[model samples]
Target chain A: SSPGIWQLDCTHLEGKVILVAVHVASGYIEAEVIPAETGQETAYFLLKLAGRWPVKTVHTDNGSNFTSTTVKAACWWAGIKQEDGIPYNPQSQGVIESMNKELKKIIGQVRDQAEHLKTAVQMAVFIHNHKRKGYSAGERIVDIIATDI
Target chain B: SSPGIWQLDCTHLEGKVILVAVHVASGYIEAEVIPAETGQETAYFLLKLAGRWPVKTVHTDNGSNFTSTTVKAACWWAGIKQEDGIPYNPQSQGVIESMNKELKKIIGQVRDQAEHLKTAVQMAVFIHNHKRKGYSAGERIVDIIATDI
Candidate 1:
């Protein structure tokens, strides 16, 4: 992870939007769905996710929501050391790209299985979190949410 | 600003088991209305958020799920730092206290206005991801449903 870059994107699903992120050092994946692709939702997107909190820094595509003050401050207040992301290059976003693929798959399958979008998505989330990292991460999630709240 | 201790709890509501779930950062309240507040629910919660993407440590009230191999490994995989709080003490659980309040209020208000139980449960779909500004985020359920142009 270069000091100058991290990647971000907003993909729509019907009426909802998905917010994605990459933790440089850890090679971790994060995604969120929000009502609108506005700064508040974007910032709040970063604010949640027990997998990420007291957010240190990020790299994102140049979007109004990602570049807005609300998002900037949300991370800044959390003590993020820096910011910025790969510019105009999807090639650099290889990891988050694939993660997005898997996340979408979970959502789709859950929808089919559960017979209701909310219940399906809820199941997707449940199943997804269960799909965490190996022997070392047992403690990573605690502070993620614990910090900002 | 630092990773430390965070205590967790689950207060049951009807057939739904609310897992403050992702149990995440502030302003971005992450939760799930699960079928049960079991380990499987906790594990999947972490995965959907991005495996330690914005990882943080956590300490939860005693729940077999929180201490399960699945939950521990999910965090372990991320190299997350963690801590816990009083299993029975109220002081360490202040944050959960407020959130639990909102969850209750939402369910109650929806049922109150539903005019029918099945109809109100039907309304849960639209209500799930809603976040109202300075409001209960419940306005929509009653707003457009009864109106005729």
Candidate 2:
């Protein structure tokens, strides 16, 4: 199954909520503007992530946004698994924590001075992923192990 | 504004997927035994039905387990307002489609073919709300509207 773990989180940026997913293996990041951090929105974001890449398991904290049945059912239907970080365990979601910090910084500095915030969020994620070697977030290839070959 | 509307669906018995809600002004009905309708478990059962009653608006049927975003951020953090059902229309949820066909014929003839279908869905929602005379969907009573006396 070699599909790398993807970590999910919702962050408030420039007074707007953004749902973010970070792929640990590729350093690829995906972000989307959302209405709220409710489990419904989170599950939608999770499905969006699954559509773009092979997500074997999603890692999240136990917030209702992640733990609700809506998210659970989405994960169940998507055939992906889920894992929650231990309460207050830093190491469990170190990857997501670090990326979330870096991402906020990048988006803050890169957003256009007077444009729509969402447009800036897109640009920020684009710049962040491109800074990682070569593949942009949208262009990064999922490293799927070729079991059939 | 005295909008009496509610919706019910899924009568899976012991599988615990039943989602029920009712509004008869005061003589009401509501039951829950969920596991996989997902919208993060029906927005944690609509914030546990907005902490036991006084839901301003909610009428379902766009079924991403009730149009996800974890049921629209748990009805926008419990102010409780949601309406759907014109994709198929039918009087826009006619009192939750006639009490979800009389609550699946009163939990399929009041269960108990040897017990334990969530204890006959809490005794078939307490004998379908005590046949609506003395209150029992955990003791009815929710006509609120005195508005500070």
Candidate 3:
């Protein structure tokens, strides 16, 4: 029952919202471009698509986005669990915090240049994950738009 | 957290899909009109709107639609919980079973006359909840509540 203890958060840019979940064990990240921070519906969709289920533990602040019924229903039931972090203290969940910070910076820098926000963010996560020295960055990344960066 | 136990299901008619969450505490039901139940997006939205979190517990059959990573993530987290029932066994969870049966029948009947499925589902649930004291075959369909009352 090694539920993935991922750090989850929602970030904004250009009035568009996105959900990001980072696996602490692997530093692998997945993001979902969403229409609103209305609830956990979109976030859960992305996490499910990323195959992050039977999550062992989750560490997230009590933002409505993460703390909602949908989110609670998705993660709190079954054997999966969440870690209670010090409110407003990102240091406790540093793995994903740093991941998110670097992520936002990359997205901001490349959002204007990329044809699709989803495309750019996926690349950012790919480049970031490969830099960790586990798996090779696959030919997929090299085909990055123009593969220039 | 006085979480209301609810029975949830996804149904379709007129090729339109809708999500239903029936609150056991008060017999109140909430429905979300969705494009498809192919993913957990709409189900999550319905559970969130029902406000069962940090979920107390969700009792659902093992339909592929009801159990997914998104469903797992939303329910397995910190405090929310899920209860799995025997697949295809409505008698296992009658509150929602009855709610689903009556609810879908009403949706199919009035689906065309109603301006919106979302609107009709909400009203059907409203009537269902208030009449659960053993309905005497309903108060008879009304053309309009505004002038009739």
Candidate 4:
């Protein structure tokens, strides 16, 4: 029911850094390979993700990119509230922390080469959304989001 | 030099509709799978894409999704000018038409199943950007965009 809440995080995969945004309600994800995890880039990706869902608030770690002026401006313009995880605390952003690790492992399974790493990461998101490998029946991200849409 | 110019288009793959936005200068793409091709969805995606690059104008076909009030409002809000391609003319949006076809072909080659289609499309964009498969040396999308960034 908390579709408006989303968690944002960044991770490195195949020598590239990426920004990942996940819906708290359905576990649906939207991700992109970024040139840098700068505030500008993260803000851009957030705008793109906002198109896919109605994002009312974004929760993130204490990373400077999440707290930078550019991101603040974007959240303000988009009408999204921003929340930061407690500094020096991993449990404060528990869902995304586990998601980041899971995504990395999934990407490693599908990736063919450094050149195809972006696609591999993309595939991992797709699989997580549609396949429901770990989730119980009726808990797939795609299905949960479909009911709302 | 015309990095601000971009083309937007929509297509169906694996029975799912998606919006594709490409950078005119670098051919770098940012795409997403959406619930529908409505103006709202497209606008949201555009806002996301605008974050990734400076978008001054968006070129699209005469589809209602591109012409709807929601999209127009989004353009105005984002400070982007919207230009519609000629009606009933395939050549007006030639680059995207060919790109759509190319993307379909590439996705087909990499896709493992219907569930993996989204990732397959993403992979295609990545390969096109990083790997200069068809382009001559020094013409890769990644290299061209890097020079400006």
Off by over 4 Å in 1: A1-7, A49-54, A87-91, A115-149, B1-149
Q: Each model's RMSD to truth, in Å? A: 13.9, 17.8, 18.3, 18.4
i-RMSD values for every candidate model: 15.2, 21.7, 21.0, 16.4
> Alpha carbon lDDT of residue B80, candidate 2?
71
Tens-digit lDDT string for candidate 3 (B23-61):
444455555678877545633453343221112566664
Best-first order by DockQ? 1, 4, 3, 2
Off by over 4 Å in 2: A87-94, A133-149, B1-149
Candidate 3 per-residue C-alpha lDDT over A11-107 given as tens digits, one digit per residue, 9 for 90 to 100: 7766787677655454555566777865445434433422212245666644564567665654532234655544465464565566678888877
Candidate 1, A1-149: lDDT as tens digits: 23212345666665776666554443433555667777666655554531123244566445575569877764553344435665455665675566667767888875664433443454444445546565122222332222222
Instruction: List A-chain TM-scores for all predictions.
Output: 0.63, 0.78, 0.66, 0.80
Give the clashing residue pairs of candidate 2, or none: A40-B69, A40-B70, A41-B69, A69-B40, A69-B41, A70-B39, A70-B40, A70-B41, B6-B96
Native contact fraction (fnat) of model 1: 0.09
Clashes within 3 Å, all models in order: 42, 9, 22, 3
DockQ of 3: 0.02
On DockQ, the leading prediction is 1
- Per-model TM-score versus the true fold: 0.44, 0.44, 0.40, 0.48
In model 4, state the lDDT of residue A46: 64
How would you order the candidates by lDDT, starting with the best? 4, 2, 3, 1
Per residue, candidate 4 scores C-alpha lDDT tens digits across B12-73 of: 97678878887766566767777678876786667555533456788874568556997886
CA displacement after TM-score superposition, residue A53 of candidate 1 (Å):
3.7
Better of 3 and 4 by TM-score: 4
Q: What's the TM-score, to 2 decimals, of chain B in model 4?
A: 0.79
